[PDB]
Curated annotation (Swiss-Prot):
Keywords carried by this UniProt record: Aspartyl protease, Disulfide bond, Hydrolase, Protease, Signal, Zymogen
Single GO biological process annotation from the record: proteolysis
Gene label: EAPA
Domain Peptidase A1: 17-328
Origin: domain of life: Eukaryota
Reactions mediated catalytically: Hydrolysis of proteins with specificity similar to that of pepsin A, prefers hydrophobic residues at P1 and P1', but does not cleave 14-Ala-|-Leu-15 in the B chain of insulin or Z-Glu-Tyr. Clots milk
EC identifiers of the protein: 3.4.23.22
GO molecular function per UniProt: aspartic-type endopeptidase activity
Residues the record marks as active site: 35, 199
Residue numbers of the full-length protein present here: 90 to 419 of 419
Similarity-based family: Belongs to the peptidase A1 family.
Name listed for the protein in its UniProt record: Endothiapepsin
Amino acid sequence: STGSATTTPIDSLDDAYITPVQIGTPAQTLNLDFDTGSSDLWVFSSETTASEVDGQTIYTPSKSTTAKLLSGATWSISYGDGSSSSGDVYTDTVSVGGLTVTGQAVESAKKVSSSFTEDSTIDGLLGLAFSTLNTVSPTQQKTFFDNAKASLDSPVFTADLGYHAPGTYNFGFIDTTAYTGSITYTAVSTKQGFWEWTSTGYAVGSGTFKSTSIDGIADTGTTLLYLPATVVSAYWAQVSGAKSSSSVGGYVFPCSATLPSFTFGVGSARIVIPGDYIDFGPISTGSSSCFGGIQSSAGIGINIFGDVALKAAFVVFNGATTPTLGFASK
């Protein structure tokens, strides 16, 4: 089997991407944030505290003839940005782009943090990291990909995120028309539960490539590119007026700037992030100070190749017995 679904930016800045997912019988379609940095499929639901729902589409398990309460199971997750959610668990039929899993754990939110409530466009998350990170207790549950894998034509999914445009998540096949050149594959460590890999270095604009190992994660659920302070300082030093602002919470730059590109290494290959991908717009409405899309990972404890990096590539998440990651230009 295979599946193919379009993923759409939630706003004009590509702050996140949503992908329609069918849950239950008859189908209830929710727009979920596909997140290769976590491993829970959770949804706003009829059980979510009413005051914490503001415009989201909810899953109502009582209206699904295939929903079953997973007795005694609860979940609770806290993300790196400080957001969180928790609740109980159903199993139900879940389909993405024509690919169907029966018996998928659908984690129904009883509580969500303010940041989720305040964003009407995201109806929940669909985790695509390794199932070892799944928070369901007392019986850990598998991700949608893990459940689908054996049925797939090939045990892979691909992320093809657009810049200020829709893109595609494919399951079970590699669309050879979706990228240019060849796909370069690189080793993955699953020890922390992430798609963790080592970049071979970077360049700023038309500058020389610096060969240096940068361990980090391929994370579709993080907006920005978080890298060591040395790297980030080297990038922003090429932008007149750019500075790190403790009050804003990162590097800012004059909105009048033309940003340089940023290149990262994948083995001997190179992925170029155009400068425009690094502009996240005014820090507040009407401001001429703009927020940068490359930020320091210092104090996160991990480097994160988020959407800013991933959207410059066609990315293969290869879930073979020994997982790997593939990157191609596009």
